[PDB]
Design a protein around this ligand. Structure first.
Ligand code: NAD
Ligand code: NAD
Lengths: 283, 283
Protein backbone atom coordinates (compact mmCIF):
# COMPACT_ATOMS: atom_id res chain seq x y z
CA UNK A 1 0.00 0.00 0.00
CA UNK A 2 1.27 3.56 0.73
CA UNK A 3 4.76 4.16 2.13
CA UNK A 4 5.47 6.83 4.73
CA UNK A 5 7.88 9.73 4.41
CA UNK A 6 8.52 11.59 7.61
CA UNK A 7 9.84 14.90 8.88
CA UNK A 8 11.85 14.65 12.09
CA UNK A 9 12.27 18.01 13.75
CA UNK A 10 11.42 20.00 16.88
CA UNK A 11 9.49 22.24 16.77
CA UNK A 12 7.64 21.27 13.60
CA UNK A 13 5.48 24.40 13.79
CA UNK A 14 4.30 25.79 10.40
CA UNK A 15 6.95 23.98 8.30
CA UNK A 16 5.94 24.21 4.63
CA UNK A 17 7.33 20.76 3.78
CA UNK A 18 4.18 18.75 4.63
CA UNK A 19 1.95 20.83 2.35
CA UNK A 20 4.52 21.00 -0.43
CA UNK A 21 5.24 17.28 -0.40
CA UNK A 22 1.62 16.07 0.01
CA UNK A 23 0.36 18.48 -2.70
CA UNK A 24 3.05 17.19 -5.10
CA UNK A 25 2.43 13.52 -4.22
CA UNK A 26 -1.34 13.95 -4.63
CA UNK A 27 -0.91 15.77 -7.96
CA UNK A 28 0.64 12.60 -9.48
CA UNK A 29 -1.41 10.23 -7.34
CA UNK A 30 1.75 8.60 -5.93
CA UNK A 31 1.59 5.88 -3.18
CA UNK A 32 3.30 7.94 -0.41
CA UNK A 33 2.11 10.12 2.44
CA UNK A 34 4.34 12.73 4.09
CA UNK A 35 3.84 13.32 7.83
CA UNK A 36 5.73 15.42 10.39
CA UNK A 37 6.91 14.01 13.69
CA UNK A 38 8.12 15.89 16.76
CA UNK A 39 11.57 14.43 17.19
CA UNK A 40 14.50 15.96 19.05
CA UNK A 41 18.07 14.90 19.90
CA UNK A 42 16.94 12.68 22.80
CA UNK A 43 14.45 10.70 20.66
CA UNK A 44 16.17 10.78 17.26
CA UNK A 45 17.96 7.41 17.53
CA UNK A 46 14.64 5.68 18.39
CA UNK A 47 12.86 7.52 15.52
CA UNK A 48 15.53 6.09 13.12
CA UNK A 49 14.85 2.62 14.63
CA UNK A 50 11.21 3.31 13.78
CA UNK A 51 12.12 4.46 10.25
CA UNK A 52 13.89 1.16 9.58
CA UNK A 53 11.41 -1.09 11.39
CA UNK A 54 8.30 0.44 9.78
CA UNK A 55 9.99 0.50 6.38
CA UNK A 56 9.49 4.22 5.94
CA UNK A 57 10.68 5.36 2.51
CA UNK A 58 12.69 8.14 4.16
CA UNK A 59 12.43 11.29 6.18
CA UNK A 60 13.16 14.96 6.02
CA UNK A 61 15.30 16.24 8.93
CA UNK A 62 15.32 19.74 10.35
CA UNK A 63 16.50 21.45 13.53
CA UNK A 64 17.63 20.27 15.96
CA UNK A 65 18.60 17.03 14.24
CA UNK A 66 20.52 17.89 11.05
CA UNK A 67 24.02 17.41 12.51
CA UNK A 68 23.08 14.30 14.55
CA UNK A 69 21.41 12.68 11.53
CA UNK A 70 24.81 12.41 9.80
CA UNK A 71 25.77 9.74 12.37
CA UNK A 72 22.67 7.69 11.63
CA UNK A 73 23.01 7.16 7.89
CA UNK A 74 25.19 4.62 6.12
CA UNK A 75 26.34 7.03 3.42
CA UNK A 76 26.63 10.79 3.06
CA UNK A 77 27.14 12.75 -0.16
CA UNK A 78 30.42 14.65 -0.64
CA UNK A 79 28.65 17.98 0.01
CA UNK A 80 26.99 16.65 3.21
CA UNK A 81 30.46 15.63 4.42
CA UNK A 82 31.69 19.23 3.94
CA UNK A 83 28.61 20.66 5.71
CA UNK A 84 28.35 18.14 8.52
CA UNK A 85 24.55 18.31 8.29
CA UNK A 86 21.77 16.69 6.27
CA UNK A 87 18.10 17.52 5.78
CA UNK A 88 17.11 14.34 3.87
CA UNK A 89 17.34 10.60 4.53
CA UNK A 90 16.39 7.96 2.00
CA UNK A 91 15.81 4.39 3.11
CA UNK A 92 16.90 1.95 0.40
CA UNK A 93 15.79 -1.41 1.78
CA UNK A 94 17.40 -0.72 5.18
CA UNK A 95 20.46 1.17 3.81
CA UNK A 96 20.19 4.85 4.71
CA UNK A 97 21.50 7.57 2.44
CA UNK A 98 21.84 11.17 3.61
CA UNK A 99 21.67 14.34 1.52
CA UNK A 100 21.56 18.06 1.98
CA UNK A 101 19.08 19.52 -0.51
CA UNK A 102 19.38 23.08 0.78
CA UNK A 103 22.71 23.39 -0.98
CA UNK A 104 21.64 21.77 -4.24
CA UNK A 105 18.31 23.60 -4.19
CA UNK A 106 19.84 27.08 -3.78
CA UNK A 107 22.38 26.32 -6.52
CA UNK A 108 19.61 24.97 -8.79
CA UNK A 109 17.55 28.17 -8.39
CA UNK A 110 20.61 30.19 -9.33
CA UNK A 111 21.28 27.99 -12.39
CA UNK A 112 17.63 28.14 -13.50
CA UNK A 113 17.93 31.90 -13.62
CA UNK A 114 20.72 31.61 -16.25
CA UNK A 115 23.65 32.46 -13.98
CA UNK A 116 26.76 30.26 -14.39
CA UNK A 117 28.59 30.10 -11.07
CA UNK A 118 31.62 28.16 -12.36
CA UNK A 119 34.68 30.41 -11.89
CA UNK A 120 32.69 33.12 -10.07
CA UNK A 121 33.28 34.88 -6.77
CA UNK A 122 30.69 34.85 -4.00
CA UNK A 123 30.31 36.95 -0.89
CA UNK A 124 28.43 34.63 1.51
CA UNK A 125 26.86 36.02 4.67
CA UNK A 126 26.51 33.59 7.54
CA UNK A 127 27.92 30.24 8.58
CA UNK A 128 24.95 28.31 9.91
CA UNK A 129 23.03 25.50 8.22
CA UNK A 130 21.93 27.47 5.15
CA UNK A 131 25.26 29.21 4.48
CA UNK A 132 27.45 26.14 4.91
CA UNK A 133 25.10 24.07 2.72
CA UNK A 134 25.24 26.72 -0.03
CA UNK A 135 29.00 27.17 0.28
CA UNK A 136 29.66 23.45 0.12
CA UNK A 137 27.53 22.96 -2.97
CA UNK A 138 28.92 26.10 -4.66
CA UNK A 139 32.45 24.74 -4.07
CA UNK A 140 31.51 21.40 -5.64
CA UNK A 141 29.97 23.25 -8.63
CA UNK A 142 33.31 25.00 -9.27
CA UNK A 143 32.77 28.47 -7.90
CA UNK A 144 36.28 29.99 -7.76
CA UNK A 145 36.10 31.70 -4.40
CA UNK A 146 33.71 32.20 -1.49
CA UNK A 147 34.40 35.18 0.71
CA UNK A 148 32.48 34.27 3.84
CA UNK A 149 31.55 36.93 6.39
CA UNK A 150 30.06 36.21 9.83
CA UNK A 151 29.77 38.23 12.99
CA UNK A 152 31.72 37.37 16.15
CA UNK A 153 29.17 34.95 17.61
CA UNK A 154 29.12 31.12 18.12
CA UNK A 155 29.19 30.55 14.35
CA UNK A 156 32.47 32.33 13.71
CA UNK A 157 34.62 29.34 14.76
CA UNK A 158 32.24 27.06 12.86
CA UNK A 159 32.86 29.16 9.75
CA UNK A 160 36.64 28.79 10.27
CA UNK A 161 36.35 24.98 10.56
CA UNK A 162 33.96 24.84 7.60
CA UNK A 163 36.38 26.85 5.42
CA UNK A 164 39.22 24.54 6.43
CA UNK A 165 37.19 21.50 5.29
CA UNK A 166 36.29 23.11 1.92
CA UNK A 167 39.82 24.37 1.23
CA UNK A 168 41.37 20.94 1.92
CA UNK A 169 38.82 18.79 0.13
CA UNK A 170 37.84 20.85 -2.95
CA UNK A 171 39.63 23.25 -5.33
CA UNK A 172 37.50 26.16 -4.12
CA UNK A 173 39.08 28.98 -2.07
CA UNK A 174 37.06 29.96 1.03
CA UNK A 175 38.01 32.87 3.28
CA UNK A 176 36.38 33.84 6.61
CA UNK A 177 36.14 37.48 7.70
CA UNK A 178 34.47 39.27 10.62
CA UNK A 179 31.32 41.11 9.45
CA UNK A 180 32.55 44.09 11.50
CA UNK A 181 35.57 44.57 9.19
CA UNK A 182 33.81 47.09 7.01
CA UNK A 183 36.76 47.81 4.74
CA UNK A 184 37.21 44.11 3.88
CA UNK A 185 33.44 43.78 3.29
CA UNK A 186 33.39 46.65 0.81
CA UNK A 187 36.44 45.23 -0.96
CA UNK A 188 34.87 41.76 -1.20
CA UNK A 189 31.57 43.19 -2.41
CA UNK A 190 33.44 45.08 -5.14
CA UNK A 191 34.97 41.82 -6.41
CA UNK A 192 31.77 39.78 -6.19
CA UNK A 193 29.58 38.18 -8.87
CA UNK A 194 27.07 36.93 -6.35
CA UNK A 195 26.03 38.10 -2.86
CA UNK A 196 24.19 35.51 -0.79
CA UNK A 197 22.44 36.07 2.52
CA UNK A 198 22.51 32.93 4.64
CA UNK A 199 21.90 34.77 7.95
CA UNK A 200 18.71 35.26 9.96
CA UNK A 201 18.97 38.99 9.16
CA UNK A 202 15.90 39.78 7.08
CA UNK A 203 13.71 37.35 9.06
CA UNK A 204 11.57 38.31 12.11
CA UNK A 205 12.54 39.82 14.57
CA UNK A 206 15.23 41.17 12.18
CA UNK A 207 12.75 41.81 9.36
CA UNK A 208 13.59 45.51 9.16
CA UNK A 209 17.32 44.95 8.89
CA UNK A 210 19.75 44.25 6.12
CA UNK A 211 23.47 43.49 6.25
CA UNK A 212 23.89 46.05 3.41
CA UNK A 213 23.97 49.62 4.76
CA UNK A 214 25.22 51.39 1.65
CA UNK A 215 23.10 50.47 -1.38
CA UNK A 216 25.76 51.91 -3.74
CA UNK A 217 27.66 48.69 -2.99
CA UNK A 218 24.88 46.87 -4.87
CA UNK A 219 26.08 47.19 -8.44
CA UNK A 220 23.44 46.27 -11.02
CA UNK A 221 25.64 43.45 -12.41
CA UNK A 222 25.71 41.81 -8.96
CA UNK A 223 23.37 38.84 -8.44
CA UNK A 224 21.84 38.89 -4.98
CA UNK A 225 20.35 35.72 -3.44
CA UNK A 226 18.36 35.29 -0.21
CA UNK A 227 17.69 32.29 2.00
CA UNK A 228 15.04 34.05 4.08
CA UNK A 229 11.50 33.34 2.70
CA UNK A 230 9.38 35.06 5.40
CA UNK A 231 8.91 37.81 4.43
CA UNK A 232 9.04 36.97 0.70
CA UNK A 233 10.77 40.25 -0.09
CA UNK A 234 13.41 40.97 2.53
CA UNK A 235 14.91 44.43 3.07
CA UNK A 236 18.03 43.19 1.25
CA UNK A 237 16.10 42.00 -1.81
CA UNK A 238 14.18 45.29 -1.91
CA UNK A 239 17.53 47.13 -1.87
CA UNK A 240 18.90 44.86 -4.58
CA UNK A 241 15.84 45.19 -6.82
CA UNK A 242 15.81 48.99 -6.44
CA UNK A 243 19.52 48.97 -7.35
CA UNK A 244 18.74 47.08 -10.61
CA UNK A 245 20.28 43.74 -9.55
CA UNK A 246 19.01 40.36 -10.58
CA UNK A 247 17.74 38.54 -7.52
CA UNK A 248 16.61 35.12 -6.35
CA UNK A 249 14.31 34.91 -3.37
CA UNK A 250 13.94 32.34 -0.58
CA UNK A 251 11.05 30.54 -2.30
CA UNK A 252 13.46 29.60 -5.11
CA UNK A 253 15.65 27.64 -2.76
CA UNK A 254 12.66 26.29 -0.86
CA UNK A 255 10.94 24.99 -3.99
CA UNK A 256 14.06 23.39 -5.51
CA UNK A 257 15.14 22.01 -2.12
CA UNK A 258 11.70 20.39 -1.99
CA UNK A 259 11.83 19.13 -5.61
CA UNK A 260 15.08 17.37 -4.91
CA UNK A 261 13.74 15.60 -1.82
CA UNK A 262 10.60 14.51 -3.73
CA UNK A 263 12.66 13.07 -6.57
CA UNK A 264 15.03 11.20 -4.19
CA UNK A 265 12.05 9.63 -2.46
CA UNK A 266 9.80 8.90 -5.41
CA UNK A 267 12.04 8.62 -8.46
CA UNK A 268 9.37 10.81 -10.22
CA UNK A 269 9.54 14.37 -11.55
CA UNK A 270 8.44 17.11 -9.10
CA UNK A 271 5.45 19.15 -10.35
CA UNK A 272 7.33 22.40 -9.83
CA UNK A 273 5.00 24.91 -11.49
CA UNK A 274 2.02 23.35 -9.80
CA UNK A 275 3.58 23.45 -6.33
CA UNK A 276 4.71 27.05 -6.91
CA UNK A 277 1.16 28.00 -7.69
CA UNK A 278 -0.58 26.13 -4.90
CA UNK A 279 1.92 27.40 -2.30
CA UNK A 280 1.42 30.95 -3.63
CA UNK A 281 5.19 31.40 -4.15
CA UNK A 282 4.73 33.93 -7.00
CA UNK A 283 3.86 37.43 -5.76
CA UNK B 1 -1.59 18.53 7.49
CA UNK B 2 1.38 18.76 9.91
CA UNK B 3 -1.11 18.51 12.80
CA UNK B 4 -2.02 14.95 11.82
CA UNK B 5 -1.05 12.07 14.10
CA UNK B 6 -0.29 8.58 12.89
CA UNK B 7 -2.09 5.36 13.74
CA UNK B 8 -0.34 2.28 12.39
CA UNK B 9 -1.17 -1.33 11.68
CA UNK B 10 1.77 -3.60 12.43
CA UNK B 11 1.45 -6.93 10.69
CA UNK B 12 3.06 -9.31 8.20
CA UNK B 13 2.01 -9.68 5.54
CA UNK B 14 -0.43 -6.86 5.00
CA UNK B 15 -2.75 -8.39 2.42
CA UNK B 16 -6.45 -7.54 2.10
CA UNK B 17 -6.92 -5.80 5.43
CA UNK B 18 -10.10 -3.70 5.51
CA UNK B 19 -8.79 -1.65 8.47
CA UNK B 20 -7.01 1.08 6.47
CA UNK B 21 -10.11 1.87 4.41
CA UNK B 22 -12.47 1.70 7.40
CA UNK B 23 -10.44 3.83 9.72
CA UNK B 24 -9.43 6.50 7.17
CA UNK B 25 -13.00 6.85 5.85
CA UNK B 26 -14.23 7.17 9.45
CA UNK B 27 -11.46 9.65 10.37
CA UNK B 28 -12.21 11.73 7.27
CA UNK B 29 -15.99 11.65 7.86
CA UNK B 30 -15.41 13.06 11.34
CA UNK B 31 -12.79 15.47 9.97
CA UNK B 32 -10.32 14.29 12.60
CA UNK B 33 -6.58 14.96 12.23
CA UNK B 34 -5.40 11.32 12.06
CA UNK B 35 -3.99 9.16 9.30
CA UNK B 36 -4.08 5.38 9.52
CA UNK B 37 -1.28 3.53 7.75
CA UNK B 38 -0.24 -0.13 7.53
CA UNK B 39 3.39 -1.16 8.05
CA UNK B 40 5.10 -4.45 7.37
CA UNK B 41 6.30 -5.52 10.81
CA UNK B 42 7.16 -9.02 11.95
CA UNK B 43 8.35 -10.63 15.20
CA UNK B 44 11.94 -9.64 14.34
CA UNK B 45 11.18 -5.98 13.80
CA UNK B 46 8.30 -5.50 16.26
CA UNK B 47 10.37 -4.29 19.26
CA UNK B 48 11.98 -1.58 17.09
CA UNK B 49 8.61 -0.66 15.55
CA UNK B 50 7.32 0.03 19.10
CA UNK B 51 10.36 2.19 19.85
CA UNK B 52 9.40 3.99 16.64
CA UNK B 53 5.80 4.32 17.82
CA UNK B 54 6.93 6.11 20.99
CA UNK B 55 9.71 8.19 19.37
CA UNK B 56 7.44 9.41 16.54
CA UNK B 57 4.54 9.98 18.98
CA UNK B 58 2.11 7.83 17.03
CA UNK B 59 -1.35 7.88 18.57
CA UNK B 60 -1.25 4.09 18.54
CA UNK B 61 -1.43 1.06 16.28
CA UNK B 62 -3.41 -1.95 15.28
CA UNK B 63 -1.54 -5.21 15.68
CA UNK B 64 -2.22 -8.33 13.66
CA UNK B 65 -0.52 -11.62 12.78
CA UNK B 66 2.21 -12.52 13.59
CA UNK B 67 2.53 -9.98 16.45
CA UNK B 68 -0.62 -10.15 18.61
CA UNK B 69 0.93 -12.35 21.33
CA UNK B 70 4.37 -10.68 21.26
CA UNK B 71 2.70 -7.25 21.54
CA UNK B 72 1.60 -7.96 25.15
CA UNK B 73 5.18 -7.67 26.41
CA UNK B 74 5.60 -4.23 24.84
CA UNK B 75 2.67 -2.39 26.39
CA UNK B 76 2.49 -0.99 29.91
CA UNK B 77 -1.07 -2.10 30.66
CA UNK B 78 -3.40 -4.86 29.43
CA UNK B 79 -7.16 -4.98 29.96
CA UNK B 80 -8.49 -7.88 32.02
CA UNK B 81 -9.76 -9.60 28.83
CA UNK B 82 -6.32 -9.24 27.18
CA UNK B 83 -4.68 -10.82 30.22
CA UNK B 84 -6.96 -13.88 29.68
CA UNK B 85 -6.28 -14.04 25.95
CA UNK B 86 -2.51 -13.42 26.03
CA UNK B 87 -2.89 -11.35 22.82
CA UNK B 88 -3.81 -7.82 21.74
CA UNK B 89 -4.79 -6.28 18.42
CA UNK B 90 -4.78 -2.62 19.61
CA UNK B 91 -2.26 -0.33 21.26
CA UNK B 92 -3.02 3.22 22.37
CA UNK B 93 -0.18 5.59 23.10
CA UNK B 94 -1.08 8.04 25.88
CA UNK B 95 1.96 10.35 26.22
CA UNK B 96 4.39 7.42 26.10
CA UNK B 97 2.29 5.09 28.25
CA UNK B 98 1.04 2.17 26.14
CA UNK B 99 -2.33 0.45 26.70
CA UNK B 100 -3.20 -2.84 25.04
CA UNK B 101 -6.71 -4.02 24.17
CA UNK B 102 -8.26 -6.87 22.22
CA UNK B 103 -11.13 -5.45 20.19
CA UNK B 104 -11.81 -8.78 18.45
CA UNK B 105 -13.36 -9.94 21.71
CA UNK B 106 -15.34 -6.81 22.50
CA UNK B 107 -16.41 -6.49 18.83
CA UNK B 108 -17.88 -9.95 18.48
CA UNK B 109 -19.60 -9.51 21.87
CA UNK B 110 -20.95 -6.06 20.81
CA UNK B 111 -22.29 -7.65 17.62
CA UNK B 112 -24.19 -10.25 19.67
CA UNK B 113 -25.46 -7.59 22.06
CA UNK B 114 -26.74 -5.52 19.10
CA UNK B 115 -28.77 -8.46 17.82
CA UNK B 116 -30.82 -8.26 21.05
CA UNK B 117 -29.24 -11.33 22.62
CA UNK B 118 -28.39 -11.24 26.36
CA UNK B 119 -25.47 -13.56 27.13
CA UNK B 120 -25.56 -13.15 30.89
CA UNK B 121 -26.19 -16.61 32.34
CA UNK B 122 -26.11 -18.34 28.93
CA UNK B 123 -24.16 -21.32 27.63
CA UNK B 124 -21.91 -21.15 24.58
CA UNK B 125 -20.41 -23.85 22.42
CA UNK B 126 -17.17 -22.31 21.16
CA UNK B 127 -15.37 -23.92 18.20
CA UNK B 128 -11.60 -23.31 18.16
CA UNK B 129 -8.89 -21.91 20.41
CA UNK B 130 -6.87 -19.57 18.26
CA UNK B 131 -6.79 -15.84 18.40
CA UNK B 132 -10.45 -15.29 17.51
CA UNK B 133 -11.91 -18.02 19.70
CA UNK B 134 -9.88 -17.10 22.81
CA UNK B 135 -10.68 -13.41 22.34
CA UNK B 136 -14.41 -14.24 22.19
CA UNK B 137 -14.26 -16.73 25.11
CA UNK B 138 -12.45 -14.25 27.34
CA UNK B 139 -14.84 -11.36 26.70
CA UNK B 140 -17.91 -13.63 26.95
CA UNK B 141 -16.66 -14.82 30.39
CA UNK B 142 -16.21 -11.17 31.44
CA UNK B 143 -19.70 -10.42 30.07
CA UNK B 144 -21.14 -13.01 32.51
CA UNK B 145 -21.77 -16.01 30.26
CA UNK B 146 -22.31 -19.02 32.57
CA UNK B 147 -20.42 -21.67 30.72
CA UNK B 148 -18.26 -21.96 27.62
CA UNK B 149 -18.01 -25.47 26.16
CA UNK B 150 -14.97 -25.19 23.97
CA UNK B 151 -14.23 -27.74 21.26
CA UNK B 152 -10.95 -28.01 19.40
CA UNK B 153 -9.38 -30.78 17.33
CA UNK B 154 -6.15 -32.42 18.45
CA UNK B 155 -3.68 -30.00 16.83
CA UNK B 156 -1.18 -27.47 18.29
CA UNK B 157 -4.05 -25.32 19.61
CA UNK B 158 -5.43 -28.05 21.84
CA UNK B 159 -2.93 -27.53 24.69
CA UNK B 160 -3.43 -23.80 24.24
CA UNK B 161 -7.17 -24.31 24.74
CA UNK B 162 -6.51 -26.14 28.02
CA UNK B 163 -4.22 -23.38 29.33
CA UNK B 164 -6.75 -20.74 28.23
CA UNK B 165 -9.56 -22.61 30.03
CA UNK B 166 -7.46 -22.62 33.23
CA UNK B 167 -6.75 -18.88 33.06
CA UNK B 168 -10.49 -18.18 32.58
CA UNK B 169 -11.60 -20.63 35.29
CA UNK B 170 -9.13 -19.14 37.76
CA UNK B 171 -9.76 -15.42 37.05
CA UNK B 172 -13.49 -15.20 36.35
CA UNK B 173 -16.75 -16.77 37.49
CA UNK B 174 -17.24 -18.42 34.13
CA UNK B 175 -16.89 -22.16 33.72
CA UNK B 176 -14.89 -23.22 30.68
CA UNK B 177 -14.44 -26.82 29.55
CA UNK B 178 -12.23 -28.13 26.71
CA UNK B 179 -13.28 -31.17 24.67
CA UNK B 180 -11.94 -32.93 21.57
CA UNK B 181 -13.90 -32.07 18.40
CA UNK B 182 -13.71 -35.78 17.54
CA UNK B 183 -15.87 -36.66 20.62
CA UNK B 184 -19.20 -36.59 18.74
CA UNK B 185 -21.40 -37.61 21.69
CA UNK B 186 -19.86 -34.82 23.78
CA UNK B 187 -20.42 -32.37 20.95
CA UNK B 188 -24.04 -33.43 20.40
CA UNK B 189 -24.83 -33.02 24.09
CA UNK B 190 -23.15 -29.63 24.39
CA UNK B 191 -25.02 -28.40 21.32
CA UNK B 192 -28.35 -29.48 22.81
CA UNK B 193 -27.72 -27.35 25.92
CA UNK B 194 -26.31 -24.36 23.97
CA UNK B 195 -27.85 -20.91 23.67
CA UNK B 196 -25.13 -19.79 21.32
CA UNK B 197 -22.77 -21.52 18.88
CA UNK B 198 -19.65 -19.66 17.79
CA UNK B 199 -17.23 -20.67 15.04
CA UNK B 200 -13.75 -19.31 15.79
CA UNK B 201 -11.95 -21.83 13.55
CA UNK B 202 -10.66 -21.49 10.00
CA UNK B 203 -13.29 -24.03 8.80
CA UNK B 204 -15.55 -22.15 6.36
CA UNK B 205 -12.71 -19.97 5.02
CA UNK B 206 -10.69 -21.01 1.96
CA UNK B 207 -9.37 -23.59 1.35
CA UNK B 208 -12.03 -24.99 3.77
CA UNK B 209 -14.87 -22.92 2.26
CA UNK B 210 -16.95 -25.99 1.46
CA UNK B 211 -16.77 -27.16 5.06
CA UNK B 212 -18.76 -26.70 8.24
CA UNK B 213 -18.11 -28.17 11.68
CA UNK B 214 -21.86 -29.00 11.80
CA UNK B 215 -22.47 -32.33 10.05
CA UNK B 216 -26.11 -32.76 11.06
CA UNK B 217 -28.27 -29.66 10.45
CA UNK B 218 -30.99 -30.99 12.79
CA UNK B 219 -28.60 -30.15 15.67
CA UNK B 220 -29.25 -26.51 14.84
CA UNK B 221 -32.42 -25.65 16.73
CA UNK B 222 -34.20 -22.49 15.59
CA UNK B 223 -33.73 -20.91 19.06
CA UNK B 224 -29.95 -21.27 18.85
CA UNK B 225 -27.92 -18.19 17.96
CA UNK B 226 -25.06 -18.99 15.59
CA UNK B 227 -22.17 -16.55 15.17
CA UNK B 228 -19.29 -16.80 12.71
CA UNK B 229 -15.80 -15.25 12.72
CA UNK B 230 -15.06 -16.11 9.06
CA UNK B 231 -15.80 -13.09 6.82
CA UNK B 232 -14.54 -14.43 3.46
CA UNK B 233 -16.90 -15.63 2.15
CA UNK B 234 -19.62 -13.46 3.78
CA UNK B 235 -22.01 -16.44 3.75
CA UNK B 236 -20.15 -19.43 5.13
CA UNK B 237 -21.47 -22.96 4.91
CA UNK B 238 -22.27 -22.89 8.64
CA UNK B 239 -24.22 -19.58 8.28
CA UNK B 240 -26.21 -21.10 5.37
CA UNK B 241 -27.06 -24.16 7.50
CA UNK B 242 -28.05 -21.87 10.38
CA UNK B 243 -30.28 -19.53 8.34
CA UNK B 244 -31.75 -22.57 6.60
CA UNK B 245 -32.63 -24.02 10.06
CA UNK B 246 -34.36 -20.80 11.18
CA UNK B 247 -31.51 -19.79 13.51
CA UNK B 248 -30.74 -16.19 14.29
CA UNK B 249 -27.20 -15.56 13.00
CA UNK B 250 -24.36 -13.05 13.13
CA UNK B 251 -21.77 -12.97 10.32
CA UNK B 252 -18.06 -12.02 10.24
CA UNK B 253 -18.70 -8.40 9.18
CA UNK B 254 -20.69 -7.73 12.36
CA UNK B 255 -17.56 -8.51 14.31
CA UNK B 256 -15.31 -6.64 11.80
CA UNK B 257 -17.33 -3.42 11.96
CA UNK B 258 -17.56 -3.31 15.80
CA UNK B 259 -13.94 -4.40 16.20
CA UNK B 260 -13.10 -1.40 14.03
CA UNK B 261 -15.49 0.96 15.77
CA UNK B 262 -13.91 0.16 19.11
CA UNK B 263 -10.37 0.85 17.85
CA UNK B 264 -11.49 4.17 16.34
CA UNK B 265 -13.09 5.27 19.61
CA UNK B 266 -10.07 4.23 21.71
CA UNK B 267 -7.70 6.21 19.46
CA UNK B 268 -9.86 9.28 18.91
CA UNK B 269 -12.11 9.53 21.97
CA UNK B 270 -14.83 10.43 19.44
CA UNK B 271 -17.91 8.52 18.26
CA UNK B 272 -17.44 6.14 15.33
CA UNK B 273 -19.64 7.10 12.37
CA UNK B 274 -21.22 3.64 12.44
CA UNK B 275 -24.15 4.16 9.97
CA UNK B 276 -21.78 5.97 7.57
CA UNK B 277 -18.98 3.37 7.56
CA UNK B 278 -21.50 0.53 7.14
CA UNK B 279 -22.79 2.39 4.11
CA UNK B 280 -19.35 3.24 2.52
CA UNK B 281 -17.85 -0.20 3.21
CA UNK B 282 -20.89 -1.81 1.55
CA UNK B 283 -22.35 -3.64 4.60
N1 NAD C 1 14.74 29.03 1.61
C1 NAD C 1 15.04 27.91 2.27
O1 NAD C 1 14.72 26.81 1.82
C2 NAD C 1 15.84 27.98 3.55
C3 NAD C 1 16.61 26.91 3.98
C4 NAD C 1 17.36 27.00 5.15
C5 NAD C 1 17.31 28.18 5.88
N2 NAD C 1 16.54 29.20 5.45
C6 NAD C 1 16.54 30.46 6.17
O2 NAD C 1 17.91 30.85 6.25
C7 NAD C 1 18.11 31.63 7.44
C8 NAD C 1 19.26 31.07 8.28
O3 NAD C 1 18.92 29.75 8.70
P1 NAD C 1 20.03 28.74 9.28
O4 NAD C 1 19.31 27.45 9.52
O5 NAD C 1 21.24 28.70 8.41
O6 NAD C 1 20.29 29.50 10.67
P2 NAD C 1 21.46 29.11 11.71
O7 NAD C 1 20.93 29.41 13.08
O8 NAD C 1 22.03 27.77 11.42
O9 NAD C 1 22.52 30.22 11.30
C9 NAD C 1 22.30 31.59 11.68
C10 NAD C 1 23.28 32.52 10.97
O10 NAD C 1 22.87 33.90 11.00
C11 NAD C 1 23.86 34.72 11.63
N3 NAD C 1 23.17 35.78 12.38
C12 NAD C 1 22.17 35.62 13.27
N4 NAD C 1 21.77 36.81 13.76
C13 NAD C 1 22.50 37.76 13.16
C14 NAD C 1 22.57 39.14 13.20
N5 NAD C 1 21.76 39.86 14.01
N6 NAD C 1 23.46 39.78 12.43
C15 NAD C 1 24.30 39.12 11.62
N7 NAD C 1 24.29 37.78 11.52
C16 NAD C 1 23.42 37.07 12.25
C17 NAD C 1 24.69 33.77 12.49
O11 NAD C 1 26.02 34.20 12.71
C18 NAD C 1 24.65 32.53 11.63
O12 NAD C 1 25.64 32.63 10.62
C19 NAD C 1 16.80 31.59 8.19
O13 NAD C 1 16.14 32.84 7.99
C20 NAD C 1 16.04 30.42 7.59
O14 NAD C 1 14.63 30.59 7.61
C21 NAD C 1 15.84 29.13 4.32
N1 NAD D 1 -14.45 -11.09 11.47
C1 NAD D 1 -13.31 -10.66 12.04
O1 NAD D 1 -13.16 -9.47 12.30
C2 NAD D 1 -12.23 -11.63 12.40
C3 NAD D 1 -11.23 -11.30 13.31
C4 NAD D 1 -10.25 -12.25 13.62
C5 NAD D 1 -10.29 -13.51 13.02
N2 NAD D 1 -11.26 -13.79 12.13
C6 NAD D 1 -11.34 -15.07 11.46
O2 NAD D 1 -11.39 -16.12 12.42
C7 NAD D 1 -10.78 -17.30 11.86
C8 NAD D 1 -9.75 -17.88 12.82
O3 NAD D 1 -8.73 -16.93 12.94
P1 NAD D 1 -7.61 -17.05 14.07
O4 NAD D 1 -6.79 -15.81 13.91
O5 NAD D 1 -8.25 -17.32 15.42
O6 NAD D 1 -6.81 -18.33 13.55
P2 NAD D 1 -5.75 -19.13 14.47
O7 NAD D 1 -4.72 -19.70 13.54
O8 NAD D 1 -5.35 -18.27 15.66
O9 NAD D 1 -6.59 -20.40 15.02
C9 NAD D 1 -7.11 -21.38 14.11
C10 NAD D 1 -8.18 -22.24 14.79
O10 NAD D 1 -8.90 -23.04 13.82
C11 NAD D 1 -8.78 -24.42 14.14
N3 NAD D 1 -8.70 -25.20 12.89
C12 NAD D 1 -7.89 -24.98 11.84
N4 NAD D 1 -8.14 -25.89 10.87
C13 NAD D 1 -9.14 -26.69 11.30
C14 NAD D 1 -9.83 -27.77 10.80
N5 NAD D 1 -9.54 -28.26 9.59
N6 NAD D 1 -10.79 -28.34 11.54
C15 NAD D 1 -11.12 -27.89 12.76
N7 NAD D 1 -10.49 -26.84 13.32
C16 NAD D 1 -9.51 -26.22 12.63
C17 NAD D 1 -7.53 -24.55 14.99
O11 NAD D 1 -7.56 -25.71 15.81
C18 NAD D 1 -7.61 -23.26 15.78
O12 NAD D 1 -8.53 -23.45 16.83
C19 NAD D 1 -10.15 -16.88 10.55
O13 NAD D 1 -10.96 -17.34 9.50
C20 NAD D 1 -10.14 -15.36 10.57
O14 NAD D 1 -10.32 -14.78 9.27
C21 NAD D 1 -12.21 -12.89 11.82
Amino acid sequence: KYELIGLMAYPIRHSLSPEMQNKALEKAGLPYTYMAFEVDNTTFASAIEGLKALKMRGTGVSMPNKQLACEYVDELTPAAKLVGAINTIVNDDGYLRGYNTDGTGHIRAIKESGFDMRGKTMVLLGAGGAATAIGAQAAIEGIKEIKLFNRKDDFFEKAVAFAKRVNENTDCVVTVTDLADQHAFTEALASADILTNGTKVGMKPLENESLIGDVSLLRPELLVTECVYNPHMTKLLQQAQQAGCKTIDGYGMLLWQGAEQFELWTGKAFPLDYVKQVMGFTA
